[PDB]
Amino acid sequence: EWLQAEIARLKGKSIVPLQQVKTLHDWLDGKRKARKSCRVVGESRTGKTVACDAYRYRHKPQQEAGRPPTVPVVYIRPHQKCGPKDLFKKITEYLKYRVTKGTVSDFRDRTIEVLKGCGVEMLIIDEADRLKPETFADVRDIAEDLGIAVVLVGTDRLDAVIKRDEQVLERFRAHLRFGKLSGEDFKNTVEMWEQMVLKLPVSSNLKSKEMLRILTSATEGYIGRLDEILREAAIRSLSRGLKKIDKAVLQEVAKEY
Amino acid sequence: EWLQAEIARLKGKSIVPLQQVKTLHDWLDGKRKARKSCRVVGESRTGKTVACDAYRYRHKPQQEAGRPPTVPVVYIRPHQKCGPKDLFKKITEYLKYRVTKGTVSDFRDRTIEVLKGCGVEMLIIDEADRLKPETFADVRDIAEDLGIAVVLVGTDRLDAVIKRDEQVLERFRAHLRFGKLSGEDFKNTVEMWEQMVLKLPVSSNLKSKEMLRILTSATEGYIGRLDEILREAAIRSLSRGLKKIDKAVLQEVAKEY
Amino acid sequence: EWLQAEIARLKGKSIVPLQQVKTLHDWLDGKRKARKSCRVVGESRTGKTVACDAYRYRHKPQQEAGRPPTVPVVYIRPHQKCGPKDLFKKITEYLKYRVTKGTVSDFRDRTIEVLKGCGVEMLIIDEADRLKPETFADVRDIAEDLGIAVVLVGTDRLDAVIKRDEQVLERFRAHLRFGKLSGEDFKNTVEMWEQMVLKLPVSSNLKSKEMLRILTSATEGYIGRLDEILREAAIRSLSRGLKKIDKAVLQEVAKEY
Amino acid sequence: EAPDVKPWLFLIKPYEGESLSHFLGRFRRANHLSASGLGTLAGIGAIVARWERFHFNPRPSQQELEAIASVVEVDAQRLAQMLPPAGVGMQHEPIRLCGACYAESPCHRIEWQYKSVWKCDRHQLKILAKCPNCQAPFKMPALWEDGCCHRCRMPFAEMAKLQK
Ligand SMILES: Nc1ncnc2c1ncn2[C@@H]1O[C@H](COP(=O)(O)OP(=O)(O)OP(=O)(O)O)[C@@H](O)[C@H]1O
Ligand SMILES: Nc1ncnc2c1ncn2[C@@H]1O[C@H](COP(=O)(O)OP(=O)(O)OP(=O)(O)O)[C@@H](O)[C@H]1O
Ligand SMILES: Nc1ncnc2c1ncn2[C@@H]1O[C@H](COP(=O)(O)OP(=O)(O)OP(=O)(O)O)[C@@H](O)[C@H]1O
Ligand SMILES: [Mg+2]
Ligand SMILES: [Mg+2]
Ligand SMILES: [Mg+2]
Ligand SMILES: [Mg+2]
Ligand SMILES: [Zn+2]
Ligand SMILES: [Zn+2]
């Protein structure tokens, strides 16, 4: 059945090459090249994770015969209230090593030698505000002692925790702000969703002013609201047998927000 | 004795196919189909728990010997001040996964593996305002790392809790409002209770204007108060050898509120 | 339908480029260039708020590719009895930053941080008389420690509040007076409303001396009365199947003042 | 509860010659169990950590194999086939590997620990007793998660061409 494959597609995620993503990638290239620590900050659902995650796919590991793999960028997301030992485990497991026993010092030491063993140059810590306060000390040590571009990612909650340790505030001082969408750029993102994400058999003219009106009120510029609204509206419309999003279905979705 | 069997029946609980339940179930089917996280909100005793509990039976598991069960809908009510370990225990105990001991890290990793292996597609967290603010991070990760619609259920206290964390707020902002009964819907529900729930030997005619007036004052439209009043009124009537709810017995019960 | 579309338009608000708006904008441009603090004072419903809104829309935030926006003009209206934390929350949210939970000192330091880097040149505080007297100290510190032109807006009630504190009075000494309309300026303003705001199918001839007589008696030169009388008169007239305002409907509205 | 669900655990199929140490390690990883955890789950306590090192004073008893055959769904007769048969001398310390077998079946074979075994007759290769690339000794078969040398990360399947 054709319907099942479209719904199975529309429920899944996709990556759209927004200029907001290109901005971070060129910027992260500068911080990685300069081997510079920094932070990424912005409101929820602005796309920080997807842009950082896409950057890791852009620099997949490399190998040589009889050598460990080399991993230019590591991307990790700590669990909430991440203590030092579990951060070392996160880094260790991303590098496919294992450490079954040891003190926290032994986990740290094994982390240092596997980081420099794989020769990583940038470490992105997504939702870094999940780190315990003491874990930022070990993050600072990994930054300085080995010369890794550490990139902390979070919301304004990350700025609030970084202000509580002068040594973290100092070495993570450089930052990039993720903005919300607005103006014609939001509109351009709406049409990019219509043609590169929705791909429905008939066009919906979501770029039209009357569609943009309700979308702007419901999305408010969050790319996560845009994606979640349009995918549900498309799924609902196909379930109703429509070949497109209708304004009435888009209204029925937007009423829930 | 027949009386003892009528009391054993009337003291129990049953599920009546109200339109509010039908409305929720159709809505959950869309959210499950789209894998969209959302919330169900409505004041106390409006039938949210009964309607959500009815939805899991409508998707009861299928299992083969020596395999994880296919369980599309998981339903949990956390205990008060649920931390992350108790969250993982509730989920793995619902799926009857046998490992009940280990660290929070093991419980996390086993839970994510169990959710994936059982093919879960919707997770309903009833009284989600009982979750600790740190454990909402694990709830968000279930919704992001797996294609799972998470449904948070609660009273308006849940709306307050969600607004204190922008990351939860922007994930769970699609909502359904459960209502109280009023007017003709209440009158329709009163007659369904007599014929489907009470099933007394003789018609009480609770549908009548004067009985409906008593019920409207005492119930205030709460379906919980309707069920609790009419069952107790039936039990009192039957215990005194009445064949129906009499006016005087319904008034005796109503004046306790 | 025609009628509901026209009613939905007239129900709303719009900005007319009155000369007193341009006068304020050129004056605010001078004050912003000099970073000089000042006050804007004028009778209620003379148009101060709309003219201040029009200014910050002409000087909206500018993006610079992953930097925080350059936002030269901040506009806030404090809620009644605005304390210092409320004031800092107003400013921070305007700059598209989320207020993290913390002390007044955390809010102050974060606000002072984001007023820099966003490059704020001018802060317009509308209904500045809603500020608590202790909140003016923090407003003065923003003007003193950052090079920011703070503009207090209010009615003559502001001019009394300010004179209760010499340190505030002596900083906001420079002022602009917003006036009421009269004479030829009022006659032109009526002409502009007929053409640019009401936009009825047929000319209402509101420049006529008999129409001006009605309007001048009821409006008394308040642009707020002019707008809300003429919109209501147009809505009443269209609802009656008239294609213009007429004297009878206009008198029927004007009689309520 | 989930209605009409039977209490269950993640299972693994034992390979035809897989050693008990290797098997328990896979079962533990499939359930994110620590070695102490499985012993507590079977009730035999710390014995599991001892068996995973091939420390078989005493050998796995009938009682304990039947205990492990309660949490693992593999029966105790098949668990006894994960161990040397009666009177076959075995060595625990030098852990050994054929590599060409590991490319066909990712398990340690208990026969690689027999004092009588030195070649793979199937492949006609001398079995390895340390990594041929970097000379690191192999870890206990319970810890073969990666299927590669823990030092130089050479996969065991590639060490097939570095044999005999
Ligand atoms: N570049 C993109 N292409 C396609 N969809 C995107 C993109 N960025 C964001 N989205 C959509 O928005 C959602 C939220 O984005 P993302 O996961 O990056 O959030 P975030 O900014 O890291 O938020 P938070 O700080 O709340 O964790 C995505 O899951 C996806 O649905
Ligand atoms: N569909 C129904 N059929 C029969 N009885 C019902 C139904 N819904 C509610 N009830 C009755 O009302 C009582 C309260 O309903 P329920 O537990 O679902 O409320 P709730 O909205 O989840 O409340 P709370 O928010 O206070 O936890 C039930 O225990 C039962 O007596
Ligand atoms: N430039 C304008 N163009 C169109 N309508 C205007 C304009 N200025 C004022 N109005 C009308 O007058 C109303 C009152 O104006 P405004 O809100 O700016 O008053 P104000 O001076 O800030 O009053 P107050 O001191 O009572 O708060 C507006 O809501 C609108 O209806
Ligand atoms: Mg993110
Ligand atoms: Mg409940
Ligand atoms: Mg005003
Ligand atoms: Mg020896
Ligand atoms: Zn072999
Ligand atoms: Zn090696």
Locate D142 and state its tokens: 């319970």
Residue with the two structure tokens 């500020």: C131
**CA A253/CA A229 separation, integer angstroms:** 7
CB–CB of C78/C154 below 8 Å? no
How would you classify residue A47: left for phi > 0, otherwise alpha for psi between -120 and 50, otherwise beta? left
Which ligand gives the minimal distance to the CA of C17? 3
Helix (H) or strand (E) holding B75: strand B73-76
Residue nearest to atom 22 of ligand 3 (CA): C49
Question: Is the CB of A11 less than 8 angstroms away from the CB of B34?
Answer: yes
Q: Which residues contact B52 (CB under 8 A, 6 or more apart)?
A: B24, B40, B75, B124, B126, B151, B153
**CA D133/CA C181 separation, integer angstroms:** 93
**CA D109/CA D119 separation, integer angstroms:** 13
Residue A116: name the closest of A85, A147, A89, A90 by CA: A147
Question: Is the CB of B134 less than 8 angstroms away from the CB of A81?
Answer: yes
According to DSSP, residue C45 is labeled T
According to DSSP, residue A40 is labeled E
What does each C-alpha distance from B168 to B150, C140, D85 come to in angstroms?
11, 37, 58
Measured from the Cα of C231, ligand 3's closest atom is 31
C39 φ, ψ (degrees, to nearest 5): -130, 150
Locate C188 and state its tokens: 């032109």
Give the strand pairing for B175-177 and C38-42. unpaired
CB–CB of B2/B200 below 8 Å? no
CA of B50 to the centre of ligand 2 (A): 5
What amino acid is encoded at B156 in this protein? D
CB–CB of B243/B198 below 8 Å? no
Chain B: residue nearest D40 by CA?
B101
A96 in contact with chain D, both atoms CB, cutoff 8 A = yes
Chain B: residue nearest D35 by CA?
B102
**Across the interface, which of B33, B35, B174 has its CB nearest the CB of A256?**
B174
Residues of B with CB below 8 A from A10's CB? 34
Locate A238 and state its tokens: 């196909």
- Does an interface of 3+ CB pairs under 8 Å exist between A and D? yes
Angle at A85 between CA A84 and CA A90, to 5 degrees: 95
Residues of D with CB below 8 A from A94's CB? none
| Burial per residue of C229-249, b for 16 or more beta-carbon CB atoms within 10 angstroms, e otherwise | bbbbbbbebbeeebebbbeeb
CB–CB of B124/B76 below 8 Å? yes
Locate A18 and state its tokens: 């927004």
Is C113 flagged in the annotation as binding?
A: yes
**Is A33 in a helix, a strand, or coil?**
helix
**CA B226/CA B190 separation, integer angstroms:** 8
**CA A56/CA A32 separation, integer angstroms:** 12
Question: Is the CB of B138 less than 8 angstroms away from the CB of A225?
Answer: no
Instruction: Kindly state if the Cβ of C137 falls inside 6 Å of ligand 3.
Output: no
What does each C-alpha distance from A55 to A50, A59, A71, A155 come to in angstroms?
9, 7, 13, 19
**Is A178 in a helix, a strand, or coil?**
strand
Residue C188, exposed/middle/buried by CB under 10 A (0-12, 13-18, 19+)?
middle
**CA C194/CA A213 separation, integer angstroms:** 27
Helix (H) or strand (E) holding A151: strand A149-154
According to DSSP, residue C128 is labeled G
Residue C13, exposed/middle/buried by CB under 10 A (0-12, 13-18, 19+)?
exposed
| Burial per residue of C131-167, b for 16 or more beta-carbon CB atoms within 10 angstroms, e otherwise | bbeebbebbbebbeebebbbbbbbbeebbebbeeeee
CB–CB of B110/B88 below 8 Å? yes
- Cβ-Cβ contacts under 8 Å between B and D: the total is 67
Locate A43 and state its tokens: 């409101």
CB–CB of B123/B142 below 8 Å? yes
- Angle between the N-to-C axes of helices B209-219 and B223-239, in degrees from 0 to 180, rounded to the nearest 10: 120
Residue nearest to atom 11 of ligand 1 (CA): A224
CB–CB of C217/C197 below 8 Å? no
Residue nearest to atom 8 of ligand 2 (CA): B47
What does each C-alpha distance from A108 to A78, A126, B206 come to in angstroms?
16, 20, 73
**Beta-bridge mates of residue B73:** B122
| Burial per residue of A136-165, b for 16 or more beta-carbon CB atoms within 10 angstroms, e otherwise | bebbbebbeebebbbbbbbbbbbbbbbbeb
CA of D135 to the centre of ligand 9 (A): 6
Q: Which residues contact A2 (CB under 8 A, 6 or more apart)?
A: none
Locate A230 and state its tokens: 């349009």
Instruction: Kindly state if the Cβ of B46 falls inside 6 Å of ligand 2.
Output: yes
Residue A155: name the closest of C97, C111, B138 by CA: C97
**CA D5/CA D27 separation, integer angstroms:** 22
Q: Which residues contact B238 (CB under 8 A, 6 or more apart)?
A: B3, B6, B7, B10, B200
CA of D163 to the centre of ligand 8 (A): 10
D145 φ, ψ (degrees, to nearest 5): -75, -50
**CA A47/CA A53 separation, integer angstroms:** 10
Instruction: Kindly state if the Cβ of A49 falls inside 6 Å of ligand 1.
Output: yes
Beta strands in C69-207 (DSSP E): 73-76, 122-125, 149-154, 175-178
**CA A228/CA C97 separation, integer angstroms:** 23
Helix (H) or strand (E) holding C39: strand C38-42
**Largest separation between any pair of C-alpha atoms in chain A:** 62
Which ligand gives the minimal distance to the CA of C43? 3
Residue from D29, D148, D151, D153 to probe the interface with A (highest A Cβ count within 10 Å): D153
Q: Which residues contact A30 (CB under 8 A, 6 or more apart)?
A: A36
Residue nearest to atom 12 of ligand 1 (CA): A224
C63 φ, ψ (degrees, to nearest 5): -75, 145
Residue C102, exposed/middle/buried by CB under 10 A (0-12, 13-18, 19+)?
middle
Locate A40 and state its tokens: 């990424």
**CA D134/CA D152 separation, integer angstroms:** 7
Instruction: Kindly state if the Cβ of C47 falls inside 6 Å of ligand 3.
Output: yes
Instruction: Kindly state if the Cβ of B21 falls inside 6 Å of ligand 2.
Output: yes
Residue with the two structure tokens 């603090």: C37
Locate C130 and state its tokens: 């809603």
How far is CA B211 from its chain centroid? 28
**CA C231/CA C114 separation, integer angstroms:** 41
Angle at A75 between CA A69 and CA A79, to 5 degrees: 125
Helix (H) or strand (E) holding C54: helix C48-58
Report, in angstroms and rounded to the nearest whole number, the Rg of chain B calculated over CA atoms: 21
- Which of 62-121 (B) contact A at CB < 8 A? 84, 105, 108
Give the strand pairing for A38-42 and A175-178. parallel
Distance from CA of A136 to the nearest CA of B (A): 19
Measured from the Cα of C52, ligand 3's closest atom is 18
Residue A236: name the closest of B26, B175, B25 by CA: B26
- Does an interface of 3+ CB pairs under 8 Å exist between C and D? no
Q: Which residues contact B233 (CB under 8 A, 6 or more apart)?
A: B245, B249, B250, B252, B253
Instruction: Kindly state if the Cβ of A174 falls inside 6 Å of ligand 1.
Output: no
How far is CA D119 from its chain centroid? 19
**CA B28/CA B53 separation, integer angstroms:** 12
**Across the interface, which of D146, D152, D154 has its CB nearest the CB of A96?**
D146
Residue to mutate, C16, C19, C49, ligand 3, most ligand atoms under 8 Å from C-beta: C49
CB–CB of B38/B31 below 8 Å? yes
According to DSSP, residue D142 is labeled G
According to DSSP, residue C82 is labeled B
**CA D94/CA A157 separation, integer angstroms:** 53
What does each C-alpha distance from A224 to A20, B255, C59, D144 come to in angstroms?
14, 52, 28, 41
What does each C-alpha distance from C125 to C46, C77, C108, C151, D67 come to in angstroms?
17, 6, 17, 6, 76
Chain A: residue nearest C69 by CA?
A179
**Is B213 in a helix, a strand, or coil?**
helix
**CA A69/CA D94 separation, integer angstroms:** 27
Locate B184 and state its tokens: 């003709």
Which ligand gives the minimal distance to the CA of D100? 8
What does each C-alpha distance from A96 to A62, A78, A114, B21 come to in angstroms?
14, 16, 10, 49
Size of chain D, expressed as the number of residues it contains: 164
Q: Which residues contact C8 (CB under 8 A, 6 or more apart)?
A: none
What does each C-alpha distance from A240 to A227, A235, A249 come to in angstroms?
20, 9, 9
Residue B56, exposed/middle/buried by CB under 10 A (0-12, 13-18, 19+)?
buried
**Beta-bridge mates of residue D126:** D119
Question: Is the CB of D9 less than 8 angstroms away from the CB of B106?
Answer: no
Distance from CA of B93 to the nearest CA of D (A): 7
**Beta-bridge mates of residue C154:** C41
CB–CB of C236/C200 below 8 Å? no
D114 φ, ψ (degrees, to nearest 5): -70, 140
Locate A50 and state its tokens: 């997807």
CB–CB of C153/C172 below 8 Å? no
Experimentally, the structure was elucidated by cryo-EM
